[PDB]
Amino acid sequence: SMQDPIADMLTRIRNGQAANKAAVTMPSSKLKVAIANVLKEEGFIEDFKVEGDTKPELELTLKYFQGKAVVESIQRVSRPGLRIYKRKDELPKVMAGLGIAVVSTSKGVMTDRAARQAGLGGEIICYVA
Amino acid sequence: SGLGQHTTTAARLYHFPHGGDVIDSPGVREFGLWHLEPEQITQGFVEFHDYLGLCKYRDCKHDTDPGCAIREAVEEGKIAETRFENYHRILESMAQVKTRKNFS
Amino acid sequence: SLSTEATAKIVSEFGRDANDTGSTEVQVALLTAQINHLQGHFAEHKKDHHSRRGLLRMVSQRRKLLDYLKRKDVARYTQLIERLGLRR
Amino acid sequence: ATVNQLVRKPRARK
RNA sequence: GGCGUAAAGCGCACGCAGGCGGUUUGUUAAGUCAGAUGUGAAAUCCCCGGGCUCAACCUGGGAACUGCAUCUGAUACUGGCAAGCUUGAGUCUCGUAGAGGGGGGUAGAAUUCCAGGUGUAGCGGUGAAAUGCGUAGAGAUCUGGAGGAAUACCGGUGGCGAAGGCGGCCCCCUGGACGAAGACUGACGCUCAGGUGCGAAAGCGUGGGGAGCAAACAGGAUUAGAUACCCUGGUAGUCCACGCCGUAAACGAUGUCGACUUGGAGGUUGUGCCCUUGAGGCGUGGCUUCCGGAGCUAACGCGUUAAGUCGACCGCCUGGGGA
RNA sequence: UUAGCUAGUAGGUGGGGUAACGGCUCACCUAGGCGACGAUCCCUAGCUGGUCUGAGAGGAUGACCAGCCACACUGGAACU
Ligand SMILES: Nc1nc2c(ncn2[C@@H]2O[C@H](COP(=O)(O)OP(=O)(O)NP(=O)(O)O)[C@@H](O)[C@H]2O)c(=O)[nH]1
Ligand SMILES: [Mg+2]
Ligand SMILES: [Mg+2]
Ligand SMILES: [Mg+2]
Ligand SMILES: [Mg+2]
Ligand SMILES: [Mg+2]
Ligand SMILES: [Mg+2]
Ligand SMILES: [Mg+2]
Ligand SMILES: [Mg+2]
Ligand SMILES: [Mg+2]
Ligand SMILES: [Mg+2]
Ligand SMILES: [Mg+2]
Ligand SMILES: [Mg+2]
Ligand SMILES: [Mg+2]
Ligand SMILES: [Mg+2]
Ligand SMILES: [Mg+2]
Ligand SMILES: [Mg+2]
Ligand SMILES: [Mg+2]
Ligand SMILES: [Mg+2]
Ligand SMILES: [Mg+2]
Ligand SMILES: [Mg+2]
Ligand SMILES: [Mg+2]
Ligand SMILES: [Mg+2]
Ligand SMILES: [Mg+2]
Ligand SMILES: [Zn+2]
């Protein structure tokens, strides 16, 4: 059902980016904040706010160029049916280093560019292309 | 139940004890009359040769034409009416076989 | 399922108060009395395979509810199985 | 298509 | 890589094992990641060299051998334990709609049979005829009775059901669906190989039942022959009980569940508010058909009920024929 | 189109046994053991370091070199 909420998060982002929606909302969690805050610090989105404490509701502000999709495509990589893990030297790049790959490690959620100075590996979340 | 079956094939050749050959035939229920005109249908019967040129007109359908001497020969009894009713059945068969078209 | 006097009494039998109606042990008893109500019905009506689907729904629903109390608190599980006559 | 299907039986090479 | 039509979604449903799983905190450090040790024989391959006149070939050292074991670490995610939370999934009450199923009665047309009455030469049938029936009075009409099976109109891309399917009315037993207001349990969930049950009609076993329709068959036309077509009859079967058989173009030719993404013409079913100022106005859920944008698609077309973008799990297909 | 297999079989006591542990063997005691994570049965095959193909992942194979196991007309047995 909602068994991969990160894939449910990526579904709501990709639809509203293409359908010219100004802002979207979604149910919040601890992990969804730890991904959207990275995308805010990597120029893909604008802002995120939390609403509700017994029903945590996350909001995202979209981002356009002249009405053109900033996040062109995003690809869920690991999944509950098949887990994907890499080492500190097998971290894949997205568009030969243009896009970023969201990898969650023990030092928090960061990119593969940020994992070079960290020197760790773990679970690939999504290819932010 | 009331029909016949064609088991033996087209034609197998053998010889007589005296002389000549035999030719077997298939069980055939077909009638191919696409060959020639209905003037040749008049020539396809023996006793109807000697009665031609005796009717009223020089051309005659011999069914709906008044004064057909061939039809008078059937009414006389020298020609049986089983052959005459089958004769125009041949002519009415060419009204129903001819319908689509066929040519060699 | 049942009438108002039969439903609300069993909630007061197994629940702590009148508001304790959503708990699992009440939901077992709502299915336990209903299957015991339909014992003489399907004996006379073996050709009613459509109501048998509703019967097999409640048997499968009761089996799932007994597995939740068994995996969490076995003290309340062993009470209800003899209090309603289960485990056969 | 599902990876979990191929755990039970792999792809049948002719 | 695919499964609406090219080969392919089991006819459908339940459900064990198995896979997977909302959200918050603590803990474990299992999985994973970091570092280190030991090991992964040599030769081969790769890097830089040397040597044989050159090359092939031989050879130095390094790299590689993406492996495994152990130890020290990090705790974001997955797993286990512990305590939870409520939006998932459930429970109650008040209600509404429905050909949902089973059982038992009952109604009136129509068909055929039988009884009686009036009444006469054809009825019947077809493109045209014949078989057939009828002066023992058919047919037609009217009265009365018997039996059998089906429910006109209502009735409609209308409703219900997992599906095949389900239609006079009424009673009894009983199943699910949906809506309103709250209360309550606290992930109790999704999915399914074997397994289990349902499952159009034909057909089979046993015993009833018999109008009409009707395989085989009888008879008459048709015809080259008529076996079929057409017509007059007619058994099995169609009906019920008790089983069995489990296959269909069982089709929406689309497996189920969940999340989102511009919308219209309507239908059906509720509910909230409103000069009730009309069966209305304004909202708002459940179900359902036809259009159509973006997008997708081999095209046809799909297009908030996807065949759009995704996740969870299962089935199935690998040139045609053989099969 | 192989679903149940297995009585020295699974475990224990004691004796015997080998260079060493042990159903390795014997009497007794227990009825378990294995198996849908493929037991058992049938067919085929020496395996590996490697070679070859391939961008890679994979795929096919095991001659020469090297490592190990098995075998020495067939079958069985023991001595040294
Ligand atoms: N009583 C009887 N039977 C006969 C006579 N002649 C032939 N038959 C039978 O008729 C049947 C037909 O004979 P057959 O010669 O096979 O016929 P056909 O015409 O050759 N058949 P097809 O068309 O297959 O070749 C046979 O069973 C044969 O014995 C006869 O004079 N009397
Ligand atoms: Mg009800
Ligand atoms: Mg293809
Ligand atoms: Mg096809
Ligand atoms: Mg289906
Ligand atoms: Mg501590
Ligand atoms: Mg080596
Ligand atoms: Mg070396
Ligand atoms: Mg070398
Ligand atoms: Mg040189
Ligand atoms: Mg956890
Ligand atoms: Mg009647
Ligand atoms: Mg509570
Ligand atoms: Mg029979
Ligand atoms: Mg007939
Ligand atoms: Mg019968
Ligand atoms: Mg079939
Ligand atoms: Mg269609
Ligand atoms: Mg368009
Ligand atoms: Mg459309
Ligand atoms: Mg084939
Ligand atoms: Mg011993
Ligand atoms: Mg040699
Ligand atoms: Mg060797
Ligand atoms: Zn003439």
Side-chain angles (χ1 to χ4, degrees):
Chain A
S1 67
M2 64 289 293
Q3 297 178 357
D4 194 359
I6 306 300
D8 199 1
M9 179 179 72
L10 298 179
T11 303
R12 305 178 78 94
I13 295 167
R14 194 185 299 115
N15 291 317
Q17 184 62 255
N20 291 318
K21 300 285 102 175
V24 294
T25 56
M26 60 181 66
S28 178
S29 68
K30 186 177 180 180
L31 188 61
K32 290 180 181 180
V33 174
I35 297 170
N37 198 1
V38 176
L39 294 173
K40 185 177 179 180
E41 293 178 353
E42 292 292 326
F44 291 102
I45 58 170
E46 290 291 327
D47 195 0
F48 66 99
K49 296 183 290 294
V50 293
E51 288 86 4
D53 55 354
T54 183
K55 290 185 262 74
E57 185 69 27
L58 194 146
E59 191 272 332
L60 291 177
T61 302
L62 272 298
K63 189 174 182 178
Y64 298 96
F65 187 68
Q66 284 85 241
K68 190 184 287 185
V70 174
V71 179
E72 183 180 359
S73 65
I74 195 163
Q75 296 293 321
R76 178 68 176 169
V77 177
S78 179
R79 62 185 180 91
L82 182 62
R83 298 293 183 185
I84 301 299
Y85 296 102
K86 295 293 184 181
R87 289 191 294 272
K88 69 181 292 295
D89 55 355
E90 294 180 354
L91 294 174
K93 294 181 176 67
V94 177
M95 292 181 181
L98 293 175
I100 60 171
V102 176
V103 175
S104 178
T105 59
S106 296
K107 298 285 103 175
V109 175
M110 65 183 74
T111 63
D112 54 355
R113 183 178 292 173
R116 296 291 187 271
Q117 293 179 356
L120 294 175
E123 183 179 2
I124 300 168
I125 294 171
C126 62
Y127 288 165
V128 183
Chain B
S1 66
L3 297 172
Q5 185 179 1
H6 47 277
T7 302
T8 306
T9 60
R12 182 65 181 271
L13 187 68
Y14 294 104
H15 298 285
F16 285 98
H18 298 285
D21 292 333
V22 299
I23 295 171
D24 197 359
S25 66
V28 176
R29 291 181 178 90
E30 284 179 352
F31 290 98
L33 284 53
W34 291 94
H35 295 286
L36 289 172
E37 292 180 354
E39 292 180 354
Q40 294 291 320
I41 302 299
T42 66
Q43 295 180 357
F45 294 97
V46 174
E47 289 185 353
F48 290 92
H49 288 288
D50 292 332
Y51 290 159
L52 291 175
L54 296 175
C55 296
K56 185 175 180 180
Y57 296 98
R58 65 183 67 250
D59 50 354
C60 186
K61 192 178 184 293
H62 301 288
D63 197 359
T64 61
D65 291 330
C68 180
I70 293 171
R71 186 179 65 192
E72 290 177 353
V74 178
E75 188 178 2
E76 181 68 28
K78 294 172 73 176
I79 299 170
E81 69 271 15
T82 62
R83 300 294 300 274
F84 180 74
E85 292 179 353
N86 288 318
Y87 179 75
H88 293 286
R89 182 64 179 171
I90 298 167
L91 296 175
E92 288 181 353
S93 68
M94 291 299 291
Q96 296 177 357
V97 174
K98 190 179 179 180
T99 58
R100 294 179 179 92
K101 270 185 179 180
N102 277 320
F103 181 75
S104 179
Chain C
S1 296
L2 271 299
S3 65
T4 62
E5 56 89 19
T7 301
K9 184 178 184 293
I10 304 171
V11 175
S12 179
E13 286 178 352
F14 290 160
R16 293 177 178 89
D17 54 356
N19 291 318
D20 195 0
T21 185
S23 66
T24 304
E25 294 87 3
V26 177
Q27 293 180 356
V28 174
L30 292 174
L31 296 177
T32 303
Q34 184 66 42
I35 295 168
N36 292 318
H37 179 74
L38 295 175
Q39 295 294 321
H41 179 73
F42 289 97
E44 189 179 2
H45 295 286
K46 294 181 176 67
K47 272 77 68 176
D48 192 0
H49 299 285
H50 295 85
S51 296
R52 190 180 295 274
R53 183 178 175 88
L55 181 63
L56 294 174
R57 177 69 179 271
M58 296 184 287
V59 174
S60 66
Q61 186 178 2
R62 188 181 67 187
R63 180 73 271 171
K64 292 181 181 179
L65 292 173
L66 291 174
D67 292 331
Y68 181 73
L69 184 60
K70 184 174 73 175
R71 70 185 68 187
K72 296 296 289 183
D73 194 0
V74 297
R76 298 179 71 187
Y77 180 74
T78 57
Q79 293 178 356
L80 188 64
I81 55 170
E82 292 180 354
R83 196 172 184 180
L84 293 177
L86 293 175
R87 188 63 181 170
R88 67 263 185 97
Chain D
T2 304
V3 177
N4 207 166
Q5 289 180 355
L6 294 176
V7 176
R8 286 91 168 94
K9 182 64 66 67
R11 299 286 173 86
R13 180 66 178 172
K14 65 178 73 175

